């Protein structure tokens, strides 16, 4: 489940994926293009892959 499609769509919209328009980036390592490899680096990122949903889930968790 997780996501990686709405997640990148939530961060790039929130602030988890830093991107210059097409190339995406992450809080540590470029993730890959926005659609060609946005969550691909997030695909093998089980280490932070949770921090994504959380960076967004906690983005307003205690709102």
Task: Give dist(CA 39, CA 17) in Å, integer.
Answer: 9
For residue 51, the tally of other CB atoms under 10 A from its CB is 16
1-63 has CATH 3.30.250.10 classification:
yes
Task: Give dist(CA 60, CA 38) in Å, integer.
Answer: 23
Task: Give the largest Cα separation in the chain, rounded.
Answer: 33
Tell me the two tokens of residue 30. Answer: 């470029």
Task: Give dist(CA 43, CA 3) in Å, integer.
Answer: 10
Q: Exposed, middle or buried by CB within 10 Å (0-12, 13-18, 19+), for 9?
A: middle
Closest CA to 52 of 34, 37, 39: 39
Experimental method: NMR
């Amino acid at each position: 489940i997780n996501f990686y499609g709405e997640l990148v769509d939530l961060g790039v919209k929130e602030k988890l994926i830093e991107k210059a328009g097409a190339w995406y980036s992450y809080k540590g390592e470029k993730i890959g293009q926005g659609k060609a490899n946005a969550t691909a680096w997030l695909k093998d990122n089980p280490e932070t892959a949770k921090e994504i949903e959380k960076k967004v889930r906690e983005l307003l968790l205690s709102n």
